[PDB]
Amino acid sequence: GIREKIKLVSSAGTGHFYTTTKNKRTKPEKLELKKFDPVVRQHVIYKEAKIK
Amino acid sequence: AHKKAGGSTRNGRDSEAKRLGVKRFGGESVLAGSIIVRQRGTKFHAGANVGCGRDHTLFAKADGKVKFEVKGPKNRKFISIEAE
């Protein structure tokens, strides 16, 4: 179970987040995906944050 | 004294039965969205008004009677919904 879990925080200022997993050993760089934000009803870049 | 007791069996396991098969047979009127066949592969294939699911499940996209038929050069078994 090396594949830890993270969250993809919206860059739209909202605290909306998708949750997902990654291998932090082999992929040290941050994951950035363009996902849908249901609050703004737009596709916005989400960035990796800690699952906390 | 004497009950030479012993043994075992590394072979106790099995999984649950997935209840596959053909849920609606031929000449059998269905509603749209009704599951016809649940299956692993495409042992059957989708014809007219019949969709193939994520798990190769054959469901009806429309209403009507189920038609089993063999087409193609490979003699594959197609399931179609006749109109009704």
Binding site: - | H2, K3, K4, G6, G7, S8, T9, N11
Partner: protein, 136 residues
């Protein structure tokens, strides 16, 4: 003692032994020893009857063995209760239906083949008979 070299699986169900046989006609040689009864022949019974006809022909002529023991037979050891897995493979049998040609022979006279196959069938549990090569 005949035995398969490899097997895909080590054990087998007990099964049944119903039906008629298939190896009915004398294919290769001239004379044959045909099974009339039903049962299973072990590898020991097969090799003992082979020895009895090889000695009865003084290694004259050619002997075919049409059957082959491919069924493993398990037994549980003594003072072992009926649970706790299937027993250990002890010996190998061939299921014999009526009509199965067991042995064939040529290069010898008919009367010599009769007395050799009689000495062999006296070592076999099932009841046999003597057959010859039929045209068609």
């Amino acid at each position: 003692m005949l035995q398969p070299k490899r097997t895909k699986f080590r054990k087998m169900h007990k099964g049944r032994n119903r039906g008629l046989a298939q190896g009915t006609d004398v294919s290769f040689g001239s004379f044959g020893l045909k099974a009339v009864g039903r049962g299973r022949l072990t590898a020991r019974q097969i090799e003992a009857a082979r020895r009895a006809m090889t000695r009865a022909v003084k290694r004259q002529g050619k002997i075919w063995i049409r059957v082959f023991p491919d069924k493993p037979i398990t037994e549980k050891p003594l003072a072992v209760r009926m649970g706790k897995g299937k027993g250990n493979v002890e010996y190998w049998v061939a299921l014999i239906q009526p009509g199965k040609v067991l042995y064939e022979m040529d290069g010898v006279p008919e009367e010599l083949a009769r007395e050799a196959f009689k000495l062999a069938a006296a070592k076999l549990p099932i009841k046999t008979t003597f057959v010859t090569k039929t045209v068609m």
